[PDB]
Amino acid sequence: ATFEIVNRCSYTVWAAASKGDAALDAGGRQLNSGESWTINVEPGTNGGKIWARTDCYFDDSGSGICKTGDCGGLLRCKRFGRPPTTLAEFSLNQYGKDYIDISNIKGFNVPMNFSPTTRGCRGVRCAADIVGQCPAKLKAPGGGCNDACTVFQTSEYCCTTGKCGPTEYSRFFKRLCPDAFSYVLDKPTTVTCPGSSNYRVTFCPTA
**Number of Cα atoms under 13 Å in the Cβ half of residue 8:** 14
| Residues that contact Na ion, how many (by CB under 5 A) | 5
Q: How far is CA 94 from the centre of its chain?
A: 20
How far apart, in whole angstroms, are the C-alpha atoms of residue 56 and residue 204? 18
Q: Which is nearer to Na ion, 104 or 197 (CB)?
A: 104
Q: Which is nearer to Na ion, 32 or 100 (CB)?
A: 100
Compute CA distances 43 → 60, 62, 91, 102, 111, whole Å: 32, 28, 9, 20, 27
- Interface stretch with Na ion, choices 8-16, 31-39, 101-109, 161-169 (CB under 5 A): 101-109
Bridge partners, 193 (sequence order):
98
Q: Which is nearer to Na ion, 184 or 207 (CB)?
A: 184
Q: What is the nearest approach in angstroms of Na ion to the Cβ of residue 14?
A: 17
Compute CA distances 33 → 11, 78, 111, 126, 183, whole Å: 6, 24, 14, 19, 31
Q: Give the one residue of 103, 146, 197, 202 binding Na ion; rule: CB under 5 A.
A: 103
Residue nearest to Na ion (CB): 106
Q: What is the nearest approach in angstroms of Na ion to the Cβ of residue 111?
A: 12
Per-residue x/- track, 70-89, Na ion (CB under 5 A): -----------------x--
Q: Which is nearer to Na ion, 58 or 128 (CB)?
A: 128
Q: Which is nearer to Na ion, 84 or 116 (CB)?
A: 84
Q: Give the one residue of 53, 82, 106, 174 binding Na ion; rule: CB under 5 A.
A: 106
Q: Which residues contact 113 (CB under 8 A, 6 or more apart)?
A: 123, 124, 125, 127, 200, 201, 202, 205
Q: What is the nearest approach in angstroms of Na ion to the Cβ of residue 107?
A: 5
Which one, of 139, 95, 122, lies nearest residue 190 by Cα?
A: 122
Q: How far is CA 201 from the centre of its chain?
A: 10
Per-residue x/- track, 30-49, Na ion (CB under 5 A): --------------------
Applying CB under 5 A, which residues contact Na ion?
87, 103-106
